Amino acid sequence: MVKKRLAVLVGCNYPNTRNELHGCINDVLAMKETILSRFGFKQDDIEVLTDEPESKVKPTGANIKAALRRMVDKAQAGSGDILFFHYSGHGTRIPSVKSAHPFKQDEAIVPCDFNLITDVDFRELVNQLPKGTSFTMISDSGHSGGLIDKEKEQIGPSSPAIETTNKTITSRALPFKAVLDHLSSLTGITTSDIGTHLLELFGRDAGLKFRLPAMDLMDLLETMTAREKHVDSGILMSGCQADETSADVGVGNGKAYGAFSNAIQRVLNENEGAMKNKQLVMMARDVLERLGFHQHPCLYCSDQNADATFLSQP
């Protein structure tokens, strides 16, 4: 029977804004060519969401989640379907509770409309996938470590210094105050509660963290914790740790790129044969370390998926 290979590629350069980046769209275009030529993906099975001014499908929070949900629509049980999601753009960290002095923080990505997609949103996404399928997520963004909440850390801070790179770099992380101020410019509300702005602007399209009552979220987290005891289909390759940022390398000359995304491309160009998920992250860490980048890519997946081939390459 046919095995499906679906991909959603998101790149946010935020052009002509206060948080402009330059290498995110190039990351998407390079990753599209890689999966088309090496990993058996087909053009009709790849959705690209980039925010260049002439783009007809912008990487908004609703458009990203709808494209990911279209992938969940086609994944079948016992099929071994291969789902891929690449994100290059800004990341951020938000309070875990509705307080100005939270004890812990949640990781999130920043779509072009700032409709934040947090780690609990990606945890619900991978829990919608049947057993035997794989969802490989490469997030070249700041604070990308832990973007799939409760996904087991395989490579990370719990599992001689090189000179800093001479490349011209820019951080792919936005401070929480900058994200809050961006949303306040649209609502006009005077509050530090970022959930109030997101519910106000996007309603049902807001993240799970902001639209669900505390009782419904706890119950939802308990059902996911129960299912994760038997099914674990999520694979996250982050560009940095939860407390780090990811580097945007270059200037606005058309050749900028993400440091982590480029490190992945370098490893693939030098190793044409099939390689495990954990070996790809380890060799990507080696490339960034020798090149003078201080971000540490991480891997989050089950023990079995750590030994599985990246994108199930034959």
Curated annotation (Swiss-Prot):
EC number: 3.4.22.-
Alphabetical list of InterPro entries matching this protein: Caspase-like_dom_sf (IPR029030), Metacaspase (IPR050452), Pept_C14_caspase (IPR011600)
Residues with glycosylation annotation: 166
Cross-referenced SUPFAM superfamilies: Caspase-like (SSF52129)
EC main group: hydrolase
Keyword terms, alphabetized: Apoplast, Autocatalytic cleavage, Glycoprotein, Hydrolase, Protease, S-nitrosylation, Secreted, Thiol protease
One Pfam short name: Peptidase_C14
S-nitrosylation-insensitive cysteine (site feature) positions: 24
Tissues in which the UniProt entry reports expression: Expressed in root tips, cauline leaves, flowers and siliques.
UniProt-annotated location(s): Secreted, Extracellular space, Apoplast
Gene Ontology biological-process entries: proteolysis
UniProt modification remark: The two subunits are derived from the precursor sequence by an autocatalytic mechanism.
Site description Cleavage, residues in chain: 172-173
Residues annotated as the enzyme's active site: 90, 142
Main location: secreted
Record text on activity regulation: Inhibited by serpin ZX and nitric oxide through cysteine nitrosylation.
Entry's Gene Ontology cellular component terms: apoplast
GO molecular function: cysteine-type endopeptidase activity; cysteine-type peptidase activity
Residues that bear S-nitrosocysteine: 142
General function of this protein: Cysteine protease that cleaves specifically after arginine or lysine residues. Does not cleave caspase-specific substrates. Required for proteolytic processing of GRI.
Family: Belongs to the peptidase C14B family.
Protein name (Swiss-Prot/TrEMBL): Metacaspase-9
Source organism: Arabidopsis thaliana
Organism classification: Eukaryota, Viridiplantae, Streptophyta, Embryophyta, Tracheophyta
Gene that this sequence comes from: AMC9
